Amino acid sequence: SMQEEDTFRELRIFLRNVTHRLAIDKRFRVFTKPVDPDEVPDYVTVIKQPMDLSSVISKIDLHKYLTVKDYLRDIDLICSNALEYNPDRDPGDRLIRHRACALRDTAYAIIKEELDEDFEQLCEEIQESR
């Protein structure tokens, strides 16, 4: 219905805004774009399902997220990919992991403050009906 398509449009607007706020934070620069297969040619052999905040924006616009739960699974994916690809004790890896965990915690804190649970529940019920 028309009401429902306005619900999802509102969701998209909210998701773009959250994503942009993450994307402009200096700590999260490494997560803003896909990994360059020139600079890191083994990346695609290790990480089966790459994700980054640019790709999140594309997915928003493609209407791939009907719920914030589905968006957050992608934020989680950015974080888990980073923990997997950068598992070692060295400072580079540790820095990446610290930032990946900060990314996730920030995404969740924003959504916690700014997303009405009844709006999420409506999204979930519209999704379930399709």
* Resolution of this structure in Å: 2.0
Which CATH fold topology does 1-130 show? Histone Acetyltransferase; Chain A (1.20.920)
By what method was this entry solved?
Answer: X-ray
Say if CB 130 and CB 124 are below 8 A apart: no
What distance in Å separates the CA atoms of residue 123 and residue 115, rounded to the nearest whole number?
A: 12
Tell me the C-alpha distance between 117 and 119, whole Å: 5
Q: Specify whether the CB–CB gap between 46 and 84 falls below 8 A.
A: yes
Distance CA 103, CA 22 (A): 7
Provide the residue ranges of all domains of the chain, joining segments of one domain with +. 1-130
**CA–CA separation, 19 vs 31, rounded Å?**
11
What DSSP assignment string belongs to 43-92?
Answer: HHHH-SS---HHHHHHHHHTT--SSHHHHHHHHHHHHHHHHHHS-SSSHH
